[PDB]
Design a protein around this ligand. Structure first.
Ligand SMILES: CC(C)Nc1cccnc1
Length: 284
């Protein structure tokens, strides 16, 4: 039996290495990673890889790894796939912990935009979780944390993190992580997967996929939202992505909204994340 080496970037930035038989399906590698992480609530998570166009793709657990990575390295990242709308209802603290690590990267990366005060507040809960109670011994008037809190750091942000950290004395790691999540879950881009597209007129838009449904970001003024129950059919053909929008009470016909994606693979990728979100969030 021939085995391929797999490298997985974990959410703390460390690398997990293992071997799987070369015809293994994605579920095999994912089960190895989740066992390493002591993770039981695995349904919210997945592995991504980069394709030959350098696009992030979800590794499909049902399909052979080799038929997905194709010509690329067997290099993966461990990620949140389905962001829980109510992290308080997850059964395990360790689930909440990995969700916090993902969100910290969503924030530092700029995928999850955040006000100054919310960057500082989230930062303060991370520090409380990671270091425990505030200690002035480690932190003088010139303190800069090793923790990344934002896409751009300022001394004012570091100071506000410390001020709010002082307020969390006695807070345990699980408690700080729950506070982090109660705040992060409210952010307008929480758990929103953005795809670049053009509308039927050629105007550049972003399509957001999340728990609540499909979002169309046009220009600051005019954001369309289609709740999953309002979506009967998701389709792709060539470079085009289509959603079937329910008639609404006393209308005779379903209505159709069409988008142009950069290429056929981008349209298929958007279709698959929409179908997976619709299934997941129709059962939640
Ligand atoms: C399917 C996910 C992992 N990758 C992605 C998300 C948004 C836009 N393009 C690619």
């Amino acid at each position: 039996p021939k085995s391929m080496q797999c490298k997985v970037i974990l959410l703390d930035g460390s690398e997990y290495t293992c071997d799987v038989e070369k015809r293994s399906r994605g579920q095999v590698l994912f089960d190895k990673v989740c066992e390493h992480l002591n993770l039981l609530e695995k349904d919210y998570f997945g592995l991504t890889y980069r394709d030959a166009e350098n696009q992030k793709n979800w590794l499909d657990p049902a399909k052979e790894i080799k038929k997905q990575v194709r010509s690329g390295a067997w290099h993966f990242s461990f990620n949140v796939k389905f962001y829980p709308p109510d992290p308080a209802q997850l059964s395990e603290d360790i689930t909440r912990y990995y969700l916090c690590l993902q969100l910290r990267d969503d924030i530092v990366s700029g995928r999850l935009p955040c006000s100054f005060v919310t960057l500082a507040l989230l930062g303060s809960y991370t520090v409380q979780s990671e270091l425990g109670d505030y200690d002035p011994d480690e932190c003088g008037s010139d303190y800069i944390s090793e923790f990344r809190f934002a896409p751009n750091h300022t001394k004012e942000l570091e100071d506000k993190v410390i001020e709010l950290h002082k307020s969390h004395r006695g807070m345990t790691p699980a408690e700080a992580e729950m506070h982090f999540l109660e705040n992060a879950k409210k952010l307008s881009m929480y758990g929103v997967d953005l795809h670049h597209a053009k509308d039927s007129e050629g105007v550049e838009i972003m399509l957001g996929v999340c728990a609540s449904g499909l979002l169309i970001y046009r220009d600051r003024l005019r954001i369309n939202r289609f709740a999953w129950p309002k979506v009967l059919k998701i389709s792709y053909k060539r470079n085009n992505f289509y959603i079937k929008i329910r008639p609404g009470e006393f209308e005779q016909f379903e209505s159709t909204i069409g988008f142009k994606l950069p290429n056929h693979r981008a349209a298929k990728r958007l279709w698959k994340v929409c179908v997976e979100h619709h299934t997941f969030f129709r059962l939640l």
